[PDB]
């Protein structure tokens, strides 16, 4: 069963390549020893990124792990070759980035062009219905409740990227969506596991206005109330209509423990959820649309921490926004990307 199986991951803001040790219950970094670009592309294809490959180099291990994985100097799949070595010869572990992501417009309300190049508007019947985040030239992260029946068919959806104004999303200009995959454990009753993937029929052309956001790795080591950003065409006022122009705002993460308080959401926040906003209220984080991006800046990289899931009203006290926890979905996303190609 694919869920029971795992293998490989990227850990931390420095993309430390980690392999799981059969029967030892543990992750181990990889020695730079005899590593090259081909091995990095192999690991990326193992994670489901296909021919995508950005960089691979040697960095210092900051995870504090027990042992490393060193490829047998010559054993003749090279995957088994990696045995439990106590140290690396090159004194360096493998940093591997499979795709150029997390970069936007440097600092220089209404969103600026290129400020959120991963933001996409998802339309049905020529009308902006949801938002999403670019992760590959052909893959978009959104919410599962956006694509529930009867919108589970990919032919209902068109994606618009690099465009800030809805009025400038004309009939014909958006990329057709080929596949829609809801999370298998999505529960519309509780909005648990509210995440879905859209694969486009045609690859996006990346530029200053259209770029992907990095998927979050385990061990990001974010602050308890880490400052994050939300963006979208979300109605600023309740019951309001879709904002014509793209907007963005800053929010702070809210501890899940504090978010599950009785006088907040009273144990409705699951491990598949994170909370963000402001508890006291009065702060307009309503700009975001459902499935839109929740991102944070760490190690000078923009990471997708959450996708807009649910929330009682908006800018309401004791009712912060609840987002899907992309960190716990990154493996499922990798699996879906690998199973496609």
């Amino acid at each position: 069963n694919p869920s029971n199986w795992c293998c490989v991951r990227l850990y931390g803001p420095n993309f430390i390549l980690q392999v799981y040790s059969s029967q030892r219950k543990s992750w181990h970094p990889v020695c730079q020893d005899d590593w090259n670009e081909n091995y990095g592309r192999a690991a990326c294809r193992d994670m489901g990124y296909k021919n995508n490959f950005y960089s691979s180099q040697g960095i210092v291990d900051d995870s504090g792990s027990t042992s490393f994985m060193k490829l047998n100097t010559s054993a003749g799949d090279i995957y088994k070759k990696l045995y439990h070595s106590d140290a690396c010869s090159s004194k360096a572990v493998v940093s591997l980035r499979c795709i150029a992501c997390g970069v936007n417009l440097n600092s220089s309300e209404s969103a600026l062009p290129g400020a959120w190049p991963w933001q996409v508007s998802l339309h049905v019947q020529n009308v902006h219905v949801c938002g999403g985040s670019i992760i590959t030239p052909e893959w978009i992260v959104t919410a599962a409740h956006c694509v529930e029946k009867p919108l589970n068919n990919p032919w209902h959806w068109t994606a618009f990227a690099g465009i800030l104004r809805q009025s400038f999303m004309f009939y014909g200009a958006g990329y057709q969506v080929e596949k829609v995959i809801s999370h298998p454990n999505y529960d519309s009753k509780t909005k648990n596991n509210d995440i879905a993937l859209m694969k486009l029929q045609k690859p996006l052309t990346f530029n200053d206005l259209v770029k992907p956001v990095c998927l979050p790795n385990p061990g990001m080591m974010l602050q308890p109330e880490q400052l994050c950003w939300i963006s979208g065409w979300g109605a600023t006022e309740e019951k309001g209509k879709t904002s014509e122009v793209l907007n963005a705002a800053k929010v702070l993460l809210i501890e899940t423990q504090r978010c599950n308080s009785r006088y907040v959401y009273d144990n409705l926040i699951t491990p598949a959820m994170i909370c963000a906003g402001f508890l006291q209220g009065n702060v307009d984080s309503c700009q975001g649309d459902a499935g839109g991006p929740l991102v944070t800046s760490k190690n000078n990289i923009w990471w997708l921490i959450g996708d807009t899931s649910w929330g009682s009203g908006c800018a309401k006290a004791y009712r912060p926004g609840v987002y899907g926890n992309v960190m716990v979905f990154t493996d499922w996303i990798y699996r879906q990307m690998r199973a496609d190609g």
Partner: nanobody, 128 residues
Framework: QVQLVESGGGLVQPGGSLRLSCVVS????????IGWFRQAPGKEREGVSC????????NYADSVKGRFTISRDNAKNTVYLQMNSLKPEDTAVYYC?????????????????????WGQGTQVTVSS
């Protein structure tokens, strides 16, 4: 439903050993750090040990450093705390708690507010 279930507590002689176990349900250990905390009678809850989502990162408070040992079984979704050379000072209610991996896996000082999910705990008393 997510549950954390502690067991293995009991009454033991000073210098004895115990093995606490914590069964985790509702989420994967690959994305969450698991800590053992203890609360003495009428004292604040203090961090005892921590194992990260990677399984290699382990941290221990100086009061039990080198005497206790935390471990995890991902296949069994069970975290074990081996308490060796138990002292009367170790008498407390031992709780199992889970924190996400978005934040730091294991800290030197275990902040109980970073841990989002809690079990009911098991009583450990170390006396003659």
């Amino acid at each position: 439903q997510v549950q954390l279930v502690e067991s293995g507590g009991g009454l033991v002689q000073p210098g004895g050993s115990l093995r606490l176990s914590c069964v985790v349900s509702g989420f994967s250990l690959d994305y969450y750090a698991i800590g053992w905390f203890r609360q003495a009678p009428g004292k604040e809850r203090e961090g005892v040990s921590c194992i990260g989502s990677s399984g290699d990162k382990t941290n221990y408070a100086d009061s039990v450093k080198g005497r206790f040992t935390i471990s995890r079984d991902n296949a069994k979704n069970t975290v074990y705390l081996q308490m060796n050379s138990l002292k009367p000072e170790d008498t407390a209610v031992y709780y199992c708690a889970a924190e996400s991996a978005l934040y730091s896996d294991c800290t030197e000082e275990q902040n109980p507010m970073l841990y989002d999910y809690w079990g009911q705990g098991t009583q450990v008393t170390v006396s003659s």
